[PDB]
Amino acid sequence: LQPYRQALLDLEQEFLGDPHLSISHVNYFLDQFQLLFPSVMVVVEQIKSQKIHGCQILETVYKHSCGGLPPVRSALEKILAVCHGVMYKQLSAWMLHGLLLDQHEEFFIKSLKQFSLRVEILPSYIPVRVAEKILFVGESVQMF
Amino acid sequence: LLTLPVLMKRSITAPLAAHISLVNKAAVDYFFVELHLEAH
Numbered sequence: 001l002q003p004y005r006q007a008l009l010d011l012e013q014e015f016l017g018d019p020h021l022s023i024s025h026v027n028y029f030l031d032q033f034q035l036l037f038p039s040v041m042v043v044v045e046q047i048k049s050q051k052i053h054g055c056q057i058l059e060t061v062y063k064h065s066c067g068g069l070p071p072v073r074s075a076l077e078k079i080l081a082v083c084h085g086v087m088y089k090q091l092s093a094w095m096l097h098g099l100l101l102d103q104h105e106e107f108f109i110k111s112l113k114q115f116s117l118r119v120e121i122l123p124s125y126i127p128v129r130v131a132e133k134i135l136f137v138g139e140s141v142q143m144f
Numbered sequence: 145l146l147t148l149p150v151l152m153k154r155s156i157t158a159p160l161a162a163h164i165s166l167v168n169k170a171a172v173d174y175f176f177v178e179l180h181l182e183a184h
Contacts, residue, residue, distance in 0.1 A: 089149075097151040 039072040054106040098141040
């Protein structure tokens with residue numbers, strides 16, 4: 001939303017910085033954002049109806065990041081970088097220090113119990129072929 | 145915002161436990177000689 005806020009301050013220096021406008025210029029200037037918002041409005045309406053949770057939001061984000069529209073494919077890319085940030089933090093937490101910091105949640109890892117790979121809530125674009133490797137080094141630190 | 149959140153808070157304080165382990169090693173002698181405990 002920083003782009004929208006910027007593109008709404010940039011009119012403030014005209015609606016009383018250029019003494020006449022008509023909303024046809026406003027409608028045009030913000031018609032750029034007439035395209036982006038419903039494309040992310042459907043994302044938060046998907047969240048509010050499907051009761052999405054935990055890492056099972058990264059699939060929703062990465063799904064609609066495959067919508068071909070380049071503006072939309074940048075907006076939901078910049079959301080995706082933040083949330084990968086979080087899951088990276090959880091994975092930096094677990095793997096070197098044996099800490100499943102995943103309170104009230106699933107970071108897809110549910111003595112082997114609370115050390116078991118869930119795969120229902122796992123990203124489609126992350127394979128089990130490497131989640132098995134993750135889980136194994138996680139149990140590894142757990143026994144030293 | 146921190147790349148080691150809980151992971152290494154304790155690791156700042158943990159050289160205290162080394163001091164403790166030294167004070168502990170320097171606790172045994174009072175009984176081994178200032179008492180001669182096990183010779184007794």
